[PDB]
Design a protein around this ligand. Sequence first.
Ligand SMILES: Oc1cccc(O)c1
Ligand SMILES: Oc1cccc(O)c1
Ligand SMILES: Oc1cccc(O)c1
Ligand SMILES: Oc1cccc(O)c1
Ligand SMILES: Oc1cccc(O)c1
Ligand SMILES: Oc1cccc(O)c1
Ligand SMILES: [Cl-]
Ligand SMILES: [Cl-]
Ligand SMILES: [Zn+2]
Ligand SMILES: [Zn+2]
Lengths: 28, 28, 28, 28, 28, 28, 21, 21, 21, 21, 21, 21
Amino acid sequence: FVNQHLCGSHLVEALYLVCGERGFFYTP
Amino acid sequence: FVNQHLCGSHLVEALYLVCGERGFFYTP
Amino acid sequence: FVNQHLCGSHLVEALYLVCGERGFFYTP
Amino acid sequence: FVNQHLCGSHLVEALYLVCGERGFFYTP
Amino acid sequence: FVNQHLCGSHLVEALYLVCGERGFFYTP
Amino acid sequence: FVNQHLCGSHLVEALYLVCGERGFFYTP
Amino acid sequence: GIVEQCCTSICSLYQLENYCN
Amino acid sequence: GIVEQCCTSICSLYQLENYCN
Amino acid sequence: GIVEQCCTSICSLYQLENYCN
Amino acid sequence: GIVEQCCTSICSLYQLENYCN
Amino acid sequence: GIVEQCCTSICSLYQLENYCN
Amino acid sequence: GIVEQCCTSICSLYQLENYCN
Ligand SMILES: Oc1cccc(O)c1
Ligand SMILES: Oc1cccc(O)c1
Ligand SMILES: Oc1cccc(O)c1
Ligand SMILES: Oc1cccc(O)c1
Ligand SMILES: Oc1cccc(O)c1
Ligand SMILES: Oc1cccc(O)c1
Ligand SMILES: [Cl-]
Ligand SMILES: [Cl-]
Ligand SMILES: [Zn+2]
Ligand SMILES: [Zn+2]
């Protein structure tokens, strides 16, 4: 639903910042 | 170093949109 | 309402990415 | 080419905020 | 709650743009 | 001048995430 | 148009592309 | 302050500007 | 996983860090 | 265009308003 | 990697799709 | 300031925390 899709996008930005040069897999 | 860092941020958002339910992997 | 305003902002980023060198008109 | 592309992304968000209900046009 | 956290993040971007070289304090 | 401006935008989002309930100050 | 359509259901990139020029 | 005000109604750029330094 | 966890409560940076590689 | 004007100098909000509909 | 390919040239959506799971 | 320190080198989250209230 739209709210979950929009939250994800914020979630990936937060992961980008936290994970740094480690990276991440994103699976929703 | 700031440019690659800021580029990655954009990259992550684009991968989020293009990958949908598959998710993606981000390796810096 | 706030939720629609916030959704729009995501919507324009998604259009930017999809439309590429074609561009878009955004009308809410 | 990446710099204009990443600039456009910011441009689009700013136009969204400044234009409100009028919307805007984005031509790259 | 998640919705308020997400709204904040949009709020700081809008303040960045409006306030310009003046800056701002953000207190939630 | 555009580069510092676009960097600030990213900076603001990162400060939002790292500071949580404390908030932050942004001085350009 | 776009807001009523894409803020009520997730629009795919194919749906969004209809709004391009 | 800002969250109670601007996450319950759309704040215009003029409303937001009150929070500038 | 991440969406059910972090879209229902605010995940801190410490919670998010669990999803890093 | 907006990219020539506003990716080479910082455009004000007033200047950006020239690209509203 | 994606940073070498896509921070030095503009990657299309098709190209970005190579980094989906 | 933050722009001098953090737009010329990548600031860690620890370093960014120096600009919290
Ligand atoms: O339905 C939507 C709403 C906002 C962004 C997006 O990619 C899709
Ligand atoms: O009321 C709001 C909330 C968030 C961003 C914005 O521009 C306005
Ligand atoms: O719980 C969340 C959801 C999205 C972004 C974030 O930093 C935390
Ligand atoms: O000149 C610019 C470029 C990008 C965003 C901003 O709003 C101003
Ligand atoms: O080549 C790129 C770099 C960053 C975002 C974009 O999606 C494409
Ligand atoms: O050094 C920086 C610059 C911008 C965002 C980031 O969080 C770190
Ligand atoms: Cl949102
Ligand atoms: Cl950028
Ligand atoms: Zn959002
Ligand atoms: Zn950027």
